[PDB]
Amino acid sequence: AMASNIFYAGDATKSNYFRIPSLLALDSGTVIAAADARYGGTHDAKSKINTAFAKSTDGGKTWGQPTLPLKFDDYVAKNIDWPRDSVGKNVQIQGSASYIDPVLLEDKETHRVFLFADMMPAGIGSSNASVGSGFKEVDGKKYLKLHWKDDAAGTYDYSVRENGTIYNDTTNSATEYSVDGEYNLYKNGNAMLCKQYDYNFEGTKLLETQTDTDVNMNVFYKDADFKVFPTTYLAMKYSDDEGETWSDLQIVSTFKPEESKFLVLGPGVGKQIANGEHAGRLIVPLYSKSSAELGFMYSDDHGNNWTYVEADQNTGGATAEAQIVEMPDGSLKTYLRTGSGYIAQVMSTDGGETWSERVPLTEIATTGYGTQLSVINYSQPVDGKPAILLSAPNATNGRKNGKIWIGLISETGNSGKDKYSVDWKYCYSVDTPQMGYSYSCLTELPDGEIGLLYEKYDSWSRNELHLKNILKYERFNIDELKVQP
Ligand SMILES: CC(=O)N[C@H]1[C@H]2O[C@@](C(=O)O)(C[C@@H]1O)O[C@@H]2[C@H](O)CO
């Protein structure tokens, strides 16, 4: 029993733990949020994680019951206390599928909300993903590949075609199997079933055990008769009613480079270009262990099709989580985490198709492993200039000393990528410098206030794992944030 929160232990998600905030004010004034619902403590995948979603209809002041738009059912969703001793803390659920690391984006022209998450097959996370796309080509077309249970481990002789029908690719003929819009498996039109797993500890032993509860068998599960290639996928659903209902699951990572180990989202929000030649383009940040590290996916047709862009030729596989802001002419500036001990910035003057080399951002102190950041546009001038805001920790030694910065944009007299300069004029301290501060997401609320949803602890530290109710929500008026310390 415990003593502000959107997601919390005992809410409708049935998770005791959350990480990875996303916060987005919609054009209508509705405000939405999403996070990982991390059931098996605060571990990254491999684990049991669902994506939670919540909505405010009073301008982001109060919040409704969360829902779970992206969820798997192979393992039960329940409230469990994860152990925090020196042995048990390291224990992770081994055999569950998961959705991890959300991105929210609105297309303001169509009023469609998109929710993206990484989609991890059972027992997979980024660190143990196999190299490959997960797709094969049958006569020039890309289809999701499948492994049948009685074939050799390395053999994916089956494909999900545009039908939903599973085909044998050696004979090119349709099987009796198919998937529905959630990638659940059917034979002869009958739902195929498997037993759901529970998870319970005995001392520091984690027991993952079948129950008697039947669930839909899914190609992402450990127990399935057909199974996907064990790499990372990008999932998306869209909503035309501000998150009351969602579309079928879309696997959008058809473009995943064959040489990549993982290709995942930079969590937070995406961006729709407001100004210039590429107004209307939807763009979402990504990163990879591949030919490239930073990347993006964009759509010019309101979300139906997505093009992958590599932003560099970095083979590091660092956690290059990025967020994007727009300059007054429509050019883009992306701020990113790196594995080099600074936040980097890259620019694009062609709507995100090409990007400048990284420039360190000197104003902010970070660790060698880095932390996600949040950057947003602000709709009103500050000190007569277009303004952006940035939220991140400010410390070389841990994730702590959270700040909200305000950056004012000027023309430099130069051209191209050098057209604009940002003066980080204002720096507001969220709390005492010692207080933990990890991932965060900013949004501009419909009254011009700034909302912040953030991890109020150090989510890297091996000594702060599995803390409950650390995702805190605060609201500020802009005058409060205008502090020059
Ligand atoms: C897909 C995935 O695993 N994303 C993770 C990664 O970023 C975080 C992090 O806190 O830094 C949390 C994210 O949910 O931890 C991971 C890091 O790569 C090494 O721990």
Coordinates of C-alpha atoms and ligand atoms in Angstrom, one line a residue:
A1 CA 0.0 0.0 0.0
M2 CA 1.7 3.3 -1.1
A3 CA 1.8 7.1 -1.0
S4 CA 1.2 12.7 -9.7
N5 CA 0.6 9.6 -11.8
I6 CA -1.1 8.6 -15.2
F7 CA 0.1 5.0 -15.1
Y8 CA 0.5 3.4 -11.6
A9 CA 0.7 0.1 -9.8
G10 CA -3.0 -1.0 -9.4
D11 CA -4.3 0.6 -12.5
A12 CA -6.2 -1.1 -15.3
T13 CA -3.0 -2.4 -17.1
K14 CA -2.4 -4.8 -14.1
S15 CA 1.3 -4.0 -14.3
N16 CA 3.3 -3.0 -11.2
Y17 CA 6.0 -1.3 -13.3
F18 CA 6.2 1.3 -16.1
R19 CA 9.0 2.9 -18.2
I20 CA 9.4 4.8 -21.4
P21 CA 7.0 7.8 -21.4
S22 CA 5.2 9.2 -24.3
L23 CA 3.0 12.3 -24.1
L24 CA 1.2 14.0 -26.9
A25 CA -1.3 16.9 -27.1
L26 CA -3.6 16.4 -30.1
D27 CA -4.8 19.1 -32.4
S28 CA -8.3 18.8 -30.8
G29 CA -7.0 19.6 -27.3
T30 CA -7.3 15.9 -26.2
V31 CA -4.0 14.9 -24.6
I32 CA -2.8 11.3 -24.8
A33 CA 0.0 9.3 -23.2
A34 CA 1.6 5.9 -23.6
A35 CA 4.3 3.9 -21.7
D36 CA 5.7 0.4 -21.4
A37 CA 3.7 -1.7 -19.0
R38 CA 6.6 -3.8 -17.7
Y39 CA 5.1 -6.7 -15.8
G40 CA 8.3 -8.5 -14.9
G41 CA 10.0 -5.7 -13.1
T42 CA 11.7 -2.8 -15.0
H43 CA 13.7 -5.1 -17.3
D44 CA 13.9 -4.4 -21.0
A45 CA 12.8 -7.1 -23.3
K46 CA 13.3 -10.0 -23.2
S47 CA 10.4 -9.8 -20.7
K48 CA 6.7 -9.5 -20.6
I49 CA 5.8 -5.9 -21.7
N50 CA 2.6 -4.5 -23.2
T51 CA 2.1 -0.9 -24.4
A52 CA -0.3 1.1 -22.1
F53 CA -2.3 4.1 -23.3
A54 CA -4.2 6.8 -21.5
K55 CA -6.2 9.9 -22.4
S56 CA -7.2 13.2 -20.9
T57 CA -10.1 15.2 -22.2
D58 CA -9.7 18.3 -19.9
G59 CA -6.4 19.6 -21.4
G60 CA -4.1 17.1 -19.7
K61 CA -5.2 17.9 -16.1
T62 CA -6.8 14.6 -15.3
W63 CA -6.5 11.2 -16.9
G64 CA -8.8 8.2 -17.7
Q65 CA -8.2 4.5 -17.0
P66 CA -5.3 3.2 -19.2
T67 CA -5.9 0.7 -21.9
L68 CA -3.5 -1.7 -23.7
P69 CA -3.6 -1.2 -27.4
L70 CA -0.6 -3.3 -28.1
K71 CA -0.6 -6.5 -26.1
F72 CA 0.4 -10.1 -26.2
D73 CA -1.4 -12.9 -24.4
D74 CA 1.2 -15.7 -24.2
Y75 CA 1.9 -14.7 -20.6
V76 CA -0.7 -13.4 -18.3
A77 CA -0.8 -9.6 -17.4
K78 CA -0.7 -9.4 -13.6
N79 CA 0.6 -7.3 -10.7
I80 CA 3.7 -9.0 -9.3
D81 CA 6.4 -7.7 -6.9
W82 CA 9.8 -8.3 -8.5
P83 CA 12.6 -9.2 -6.2
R84 CA 15.2 -6.6 -5.5
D85 CA 18.0 -8.7 -3.9
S86 CA 21.3 -9.1 -5.5
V87 CA 20.4 -12.3 -7.2
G88 CA 16.6 -12.1 -7.9
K89 CA 16.8 -8.5 -9.3
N90 CA 18.7 -9.9 -12.3
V91 CA 16.0 -12.4 -13.1
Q92 CA 14.0 -11.8 -16.3
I93 CA 11.0 -13.6 -17.9
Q94 CA 12.5 -15.8 -20.5
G95 CA 9.7 -17.0 -22.8
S96 CA 7.3 -14.1 -23.4
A97 CA 6.7 -11.9 -26.5
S98 CA 6.7 -8.1 -25.9
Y99 CA 5.9 -4.6 -27.1
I100 CA 8.5 -2.1 -26.0
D101 CA 9.4 1.5 -26.5
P102 CA 6.4 3.5 -27.8
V103 CA 6.1 6.4 -30.1
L104 CA 3.0 8.5 -30.6
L105 CA 2.3 10.7 -33.6
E106 CA -0.8 12.5 -34.9
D107 CA -1.5 13.3 -38.6
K108 CA -3.3 16.7 -38.2
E109 CA -4.5 16.6 -41.8
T110 CA -6.5 13.4 -41.4
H111 CA -6.8 13.4 -37.5
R112 CA -5.4 9.9 -37.3
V113 CA -3.3 8.9 -34.3
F114 CA -0.5 6.4 -34.7
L115 CA 1.1 4.3 -32.0
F116 CA 4.3 2.5 -32.7
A117 CA 6.2 0.0 -30.6
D118 CA 9.0 -2.4 -31.0
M119 CA 7.6 -5.9 -31.5
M120 CA 9.6 -8.7 -29.9
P121 CA 9.1 -12.4 -30.5
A122 CA 9.0 -14.6 -27.5
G123 CA 12.3 -14.5 -25.6
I124 CA 13.7 -11.8 -27.8
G125 CA 15.0 -8.3 -27.0
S126 CA 17.3 -6.0 -28.9
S127 CA 20.4 -7.6 -27.4
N128 CA 19.7 -11.2 -28.5
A129 CA 17.9 -10.5 -31.8
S130 CA 19.1 -12.4 -34.8
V131 CA 20.6 -10.6 -37.8
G132 CA 18.1 -10.4 -40.7
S133 CA 15.0 -8.7 -41.9
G134 CA 12.3 -11.3 -40.9
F135 CA 11.1 -11.1 -44.5
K136 CA 11.6 -13.1 -47.6
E137 CA 11.1 -12.3 -51.3
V138 CA 8.8 -14.6 -53.3
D139 CA 8.9 -13.5 -56.9
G140 CA 9.9 -9.9 -56.0
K141 CA 7.4 -9.4 -53.2
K142 CA 8.4 -9.2 -49.5
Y143 CA 6.4 -11.4 -47.1
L144 CA 6.8 -12.2 -43.4
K145 CA 8.6 -15.6 -43.2
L146 CA 7.5 -18.4 -41.1
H147 CA 9.1 -21.6 -39.6
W148 CA 6.9 -24.6 -39.4
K149 CA 7.2 -26.7 -36.2
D150 CA 8.4 -29.9 -37.9
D151 CA 11.0 -28.3 -40.2
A152 CA 14.7 -27.9 -39.5
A153 CA 15.4 -24.9 -37.0
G154 CA 17.0 -22.8 -39.7
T155 CA 14.3 -23.4 -42.3
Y156 CA 11.5 -20.8 -43.0
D157 CA 9.8 -22.4 -46.0
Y158 CA 6.5 -20.5 -45.3
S159 CA 5.2 -16.9 -45.8
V160 CA 2.2 -14.8 -44.8
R161 CA 0.9 -13.5 -48.1
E162 CA -1.3 -10.4 -48.8
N163 CA -4.2 -12.7 -48.2
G164 CA -3.4 -13.4 -44.5
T165 CA -3.0 -17.0 -45.9
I166 CA 0.2 -18.9 -45.1
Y167 CA 1.8 -20.3 -48.2
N168 CA 4.4 -23.0 -48.7
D169 CA 7.0 -21.3 -50.6
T170 CA 8.7 -24.5 -51.9
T171 CA 5.6 -25.4 -53.8
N172 CA 4.0 -22.0 -53.9
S173 CA 0.7 -23.2 -52.7
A174 CA -1.6 -22.0 -50.1
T175 CA -1.8 -24.0 -46.8
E176 CA -4.9 -24.5 -44.6
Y177 CA -3.3 -22.0 -42.2
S178 CA -3.8 -18.2 -42.0
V179 CA -3.4 -15.3 -39.6
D180 CA -5.9 -12.7 -38.5
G181 CA -5.2 -9.0 -38.2
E182 CA -3.5 -9.6 -34.8
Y183 CA -1.1 -12.4 -36.3
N184 CA -3.1 -15.0 -34.4
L185 CA -3.0 -18.4 -36.1
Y186 CA -6.0 -20.3 -37.7
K187 CA -6.4 -23.6 -39.3
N188 CA -9.3 -24.2 -41.6
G189 CA -10.7 -20.9 -40.3
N190 CA -10.7 -22.3 -36.7
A191 CA -8.7 -20.4 -34.1
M192 CA -5.6 -22.3 -33.0
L193 CA -5.0 -22.2 -29.2
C194 CA -2.2 -22.6 -26.7
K195 CA -2.0 -22.4 -22.9
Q196 CA -1.2 -19.1 -21.2
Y197 CA 1.9 -19.0 -18.9
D198 CA 2.0 -17.7 -15.4
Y199 CA 5.1 -16.5 -13.6
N200 CA 5.8 -16.7 -9.9
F201 CA 8.8 -16.6 -7.7
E202 CA 10.0 -19.2 -5.1
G203 CA 12.8 -17.4 -3.4
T204 CA 14.9 -16.2 -6.3
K205 CA 13.7 -19.0 -8.7
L206 CA 11.3 -17.7 -11.4
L207 CA 8.8 -20.4 -12.3
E208 CA 7.2 -19.9 -15.8
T209 CA 4.4 -22.4 -16.0
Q210 CA 1.5 -23.2 -18.2
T211 CA -1.9 -22.6 -16.9
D212 CA -5.1 -24.1 -18.0
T213 CA -6.3 -20.8 -19.7
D214 CA -6.5 -21.0 -23.5
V215 CA -5.3 -18.1 -25.6
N216 CA -5.0 -17.5 -29.3
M217 CA -1.9 -19.1 -30.7
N218 CA 0.2 -16.3 -32.3
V219 CA 3.2 -16.5 -34.6
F220 CA 5.2 -14.4 -32.2
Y221 CA 4.9 -17.0 -29.4
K222 CA 7.3 -19.6 -28.1
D223 CA 4.6 -22.4 -28.4
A224 CA 3.4 -21.7 -32.0
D225 CA 3.1 -24.1 -34.9
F226 CA 4.4 -21.4 -37.1
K227 CA 6.9 -18.9 -35.8
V228 CA 8.5 -15.7 -37.1
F229 CA 12.3 -15.2 -37.4
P230 CA 13.6 -14.1 -34.0
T231 CA 14.6 -10.5 -34.7
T232 CA 13.1 -7.2 -33.8
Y233 CA 10.0 -5.9 -35.7
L234 CA 8.2 -2.5 -35.8
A235 CA 4.5 -2.6 -35.0
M236 CA 2.0 0.1 -35.6
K237 CA -1.8 0.7 -34.9
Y238 CA -3.7 3.8 -35.8
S239 CA -6.9 5.3 -34.4
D240 CA -9.4 7.6 -36.0
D241 CA -11.2 8.2 -32.7
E242 CA -8.4 9.4 -30.4
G243 CA -7.7 6.0 -29.1
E244 CA -11.2 4.6 -28.5
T245 CA -10.6 2.0 -31.1
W246 CA -7.5 0.7 -33.0
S247 CA -6.7 -0.7 -36.4
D248 CA -5.3 -4.2 -37.0
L249 CA -1.6 -4.6 -36.2
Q250 CA 0.7 -3.4 -38.9
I251 CA 4.2 -4.7 -39.2
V252 CA 6.0 -1.8 -40.8
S253 CA 9.6 -3.1 -40.7
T254 CA 9.5 -4.7 -44.1
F255 CA 12.5 -2.5 -44.9
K256 CA 14.7 -3.9 -42.1
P257 CA 18.2 -4.2 -43.5
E258 CA 19.3 -7.8 -44.0
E259 CA 22.6 -6.9 -42.3
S260 CA 20.9 -5.4 -39.2
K261 CA 20.7 -7.1 -35.8
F262 CA 18.0 -4.8 -34.5
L263 CA 16.1 -1.8 -35.9
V264 CA 14.0 -0.1 -33.2
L265 CA 12.3 3.1 -32.3
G266 CA 13.6 6.3 -30.7
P267 CA 10.8 6.6 -28.0
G268 CA 8.7 9.6 -27.4
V269 CA 6.9 11.3 -30.2
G270 CA 7.1 11.5 -34.0
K271 CA 6.8 14.7 -36.0
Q272 CA 4.5 16.0 -38.8
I273 CA 6.2 18.7 -40.9
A274 CA 4.2 21.9 -40.7
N275 CA 6.1 24.2 -43.1
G276 CA 7.9 24.2 -46.5
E277 CA 8.3 21.7 -49.3
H278 CA 7.6 18.7 -47.2
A279 CA 4.7 20.0 -45.1
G280 CA 2.5 17.0 -44.2
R281 CA 5.2 14.4 -44.1
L282 CA 5.1 12.1 -41.0
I283 CA 8.5 11.1 -39.7
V284 CA 9.5 8.8 -36.9
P285 CA 13.0 8.3 -35.4
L286 CA 14.7 4.9 -35.3
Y287 CA 18.1 3.4 -34.5
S288 CA 20.0 0.2 -35.4
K289 CA 22.9 -2.1 -35.1
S290 CA 23.5 -2.1 -38.9
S291 CA 25.3 -0.2 -41.8
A292 CA 23.8 2.7 -39.9
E293 CA 23.0 3.7 -36.4
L294 CA 20.6 6.7 -36.5
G295 CA 17.7 6.3 -39.0
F296 CA 14.1 7.4 -39.7
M297 CA 11.0 6.2 -41.4
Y298 CA 8.7 8.7 -43.1
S299 CA 5.4 8.8 -44.9
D300 CA 4.1 11.2 -47.6
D301 CA 0.8 9.5 -48.1
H302 CA -0.7 10.0 -44.6
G303 CA 0.7 6.8 -43.1
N304 CA -0.1 4.1 -45.6
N305 CA 3.4 3.7 -46.8
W306 CA 6.8 4.2 -44.9
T307 CA 10.2 4.8 -46.3
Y308 CA 13.4 3.9 -44.2
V309 CA 16.2 6.5 -44.2
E310 CA 19.7 5.7 -42.8
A311 CA 21.2 9.0 -41.3
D312 CA 24.8 7.9 -41.0
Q313 CA 27.2 5.1 -41.6
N314 CA 27.9 4.3 -38.0
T315 CA 28.2 0.6 -37.3
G316 CA 28.4 1.1 -33.4
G317 CA 24.9 -0.2 -32.6
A318 CA 24.8 2.4 -29.7
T319 CA 21.3 3.4 -28.3
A320 CA 20.9 6.4 -30.6
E321 CA 17.5 7.4 -29.5
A322 CA 16.4 10.6 -31.2
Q323 CA 13.7 13.3 -31.2
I324 CA 12.9 15.8 -33.9
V325 CA 12.0 19.4 -34.1
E326 CA 11.2 21.7 -37.0
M327 CA 12.9 25.0 -37.9
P328 CA 10.7 27.9 -39.1
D329 CA 11.4 27.1 -42.8
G330 CA 10.5 23.4 -42.5
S331 CA 14.1 22.1 -42.2
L332 CA 14.6 19.6 -39.3
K333 CA 16.9 19.4 -36.4
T334 CA 17.2 16.1 -34.5
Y335 CA 18.7 15.7 -31.1
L336 CA 20.0 12.3 -30.2
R337 CA 21.5 10.1 -27.6
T338 CA 24.8 8.5 -28.6
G339 CA 27.3 6.1 -27.0
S340 CA 30.1 8.8 -27.1
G341 CA 29.3 10.8 -24.0
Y342 CA 27.4 13.6 -25.5
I343 CA 24.0 14.5 -27.0
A344 CA 24.5 15.0 -30.8
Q345 CA 22.5 17.1 -33.2
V346 CA 22.0 16.5 -36.9
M347 CA 20.2 18.7 -39.5
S348 CA 18.1 18.0 -42.7
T349 CA 17.0 20.4 -45.3
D350 CA 15.1 17.8 -47.4
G351 CA 12.4 16.7 -44.9
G352 CA 14.6 14.0 -43.4
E353 CA 15.9 12.2 -46.6
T354 CA 19.5 13.3 -45.8
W355 CA 21.2 14.4 -42.7
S356 CA 24.3 16.4 -41.7
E357 CA 27.1 14.8 -39.7
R358 CA 26.7 14.8 -35.9
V359 CA 27.6 18.0 -34.0
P360 CA 28.0 17.6 -30.2
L361 CA 25.6 19.6 -28.0
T362 CA 27.9 21.1 -25.4
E363 CA 25.3 22.5 -23.0
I364 CA 24.3 19.1 -21.5
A365 CA 26.3 16.7 -19.5
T366 CA 25.6 13.0 -20.0
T367 CA 27.0 9.6 -19.4
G368 CA 28.9 7.4 -21.7
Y369 CA 25.9 5.2 -22.3
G370 CA 23.5 8.2 -22.6
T371 CA 19.8 8.7 -21.9
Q372 CA 16.8 9.4 -24.0
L373 CA 15.8 13.0 -24.3
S374 CA 12.7 14.9 -25.3
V375 CA 12.6 17.9 -27.6
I376 CA 9.5 19.7 -28.9
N377 CA 8.4 22.8 -30.7
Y378 CA 6.5 25.5 -28.8
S379 CA 3.7 27.3 -30.6
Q380 CA 4.2 30.8 -29.1
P381 CA 7.2 33.0 -29.4
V382 CA 9.5 33.3 -26.4
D383 CA 11.3 36.6 -26.1
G384 CA 10.0 37.4 -29.6
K385 CA 11.7 34.2 -31.1
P386 CA 10.5 30.8 -32.2
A387 CA 11.3 28.4 -29.4
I388 CA 12.0 24.8 -28.7
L389 CA 12.2 22.9 -25.4
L390 CA 14.4 20.0 -24.3
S391 CA 14.2 17.7 -21.3
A392 CA 17.0 15.4 -20.3
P393 CA 19.2 14.5 -17.3
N394 CA 22.4 16.7 -16.8
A395 CA 25.1 14.6 -15.1
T396 CA 28.2 12.7 -16.1
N397 CA 27.7 10.1 -13.4
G398 CA 24.2 8.7 -13.3
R399 CA 20.8 9.6 -14.6
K400 CA 19.9 12.5 -12.4
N401 CA 19.6 16.4 -12.3
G402 CA 16.8 16.6 -14.8
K403 CA 16.4 20.0 -16.6
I404 CA 13.9 21.6 -19.0
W405 CA 15.7 23.9 -21.3
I406 CA 14.3 26.5 -23.6
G407 CA 16.2 27.2 -26.9
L408 CA 15.4 30.3 -29.0
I409 CA 16.0 30.1 -32.7
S410 CA 17.8 32.7 -34.8
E411 CA 18.8 33.0 -38.4
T412 CA 22.7 33.1 -38.7
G413 CA 22.9 34.8 -42.0
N414 CA 24.2 31.5 -43.5
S415 CA 22.5 28.9 -45.6
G416 CA 21.5 25.3 -45.6
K417 CA 22.2 23.4 -42.5
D418 CA 23.9 26.5 -41.0
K419 CA 20.8 28.7 -41.5
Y420 CA 19.7 28.6 -37.8
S421 CA 21.3 28.8 -34.4
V422 CA 19.7 27.8 -31.1
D423 CA 20.4 29.9 -28.0
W424 CA 19.7 27.6 -25.0
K425 CA 18.8 30.7 -22.9
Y426 CA 16.8 29.1 -20.1
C427 CA 17.4 26.1 -17.9
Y428 CA 14.8 25.0 -15.2
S429 CA 15.8 22.4 -12.6
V430 CA 13.1 19.8 -12.1
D431 CA 14.4 18.9 -8.6
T432 CA 17.5 18.7 -6.4
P433 CA 20.5 17.7 -8.5
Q434 CA 20.9 14.4 -6.7
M435 CA 17.3 13.3 -7.6
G436 CA 17.1 10.6 -10.2
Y437 CA 15.8 11.6 -13.7
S438 CA 15.8 9.3 -16.7
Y439 CA 13.5 9.1 -19.8
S440 CA 11.0 11.9 -20.4
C441 CA 8.5 13.3 -22.8
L442 CA 7.4 16.9 -23.2
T443 CA 4.2 18.2 -24.8
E444 CA 2.6 21.6 -25.2
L445 CA -0.8 21.4 -23.6
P446 CA -3.8 23.2 -25.3
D447 CA -3.6 26.2 -22.8
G448 CA 0.1 26.7 -23.7
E449 CA 1.3 25.0 -20.5
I450 CA 4.0 22.4 -20.8
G451 CA 3.3 18.8 -19.7
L452 CA 6.1 16.4 -18.7
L453 CA 5.9 12.7 -18.1
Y454 CA 9.2 11.3 -16.8
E455 CA 11.0 8.6 -15.0
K456 CA 11.8 9.9 -11.5
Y457 CA 14.7 7.5 -10.7
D458 CA 17.8 6.2 -12.4
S459 CA 16.6 3.6 -14.8
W460 CA 20.1 2.5 -15.8
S461 CA 21.3 1.7 -12.4
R462 CA 21.5 -1.9 -11.2
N463 CA 20.6 -0.6 -7.8
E464 CA 17.3 1.1 -8.7
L465 CA 15.7 -1.7 -10.6
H466 CA 12.0 -2.6 -10.0
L467 CA 10.8 0.6 -8.3
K468 CA 7.0 1.2 -8.5
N469 CA 5.2 4.4 -9.4
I470 CA 8.3 6.3 -10.6
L471 CA 6.6 7.7 -13.8
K472 CA 5.6 11.2 -12.7
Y473 CA 3.6 13.9 -14.5
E474 CA 4.1 17.6 -13.9
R475 CA 2.7 20.7 -15.7
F476 CA 4.4 24.1 -15.9
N477 CA 3.5 27.4 -17.3
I478 CA 6.2 28.9 -19.6
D479 CA 7.0 31.8 -17.3
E480 CA 8.1 29.2 -14.5
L481 CA 10.5 27.6 -16.9
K482 CA 12.2 30.9 -17.9
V483 CA 15.0 30.6 -15.4
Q484 CA 18.6 31.6 -16.1
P485 CA 20.5 29.9 -13.2
Ligands
LIG1 C1 14.7 -1.9 -27.3 C2 15.4 -1.7 -26.0 O1 15.9 -2.6 -25.4 N1 15.4 -0.5 -25.5 C3 15.9 -0.1 -24.2 C4 17.4 0.4 -24.3 O2 17.5 1.7 -23.8 C5 17.2 1.5 -22.4 C6 17.9 2.5 -21.5 O3 17.4 2.7 -20.4 O4 19.0 3.0 -21.9 C7 15.7 1.3 -22.2 C8 15.0 1.0 -23.5 O5 13.7 0.4 -23.3 O6 17.9 0.2 -22.1 C9 18.3 -0.4 -23.4 C10 19.8 -0.1 -23.7 O7 19.9 -0.4 -25.1 C11 20.8 -0.9 -22.9 O8 20.2 -1.2 -21.6

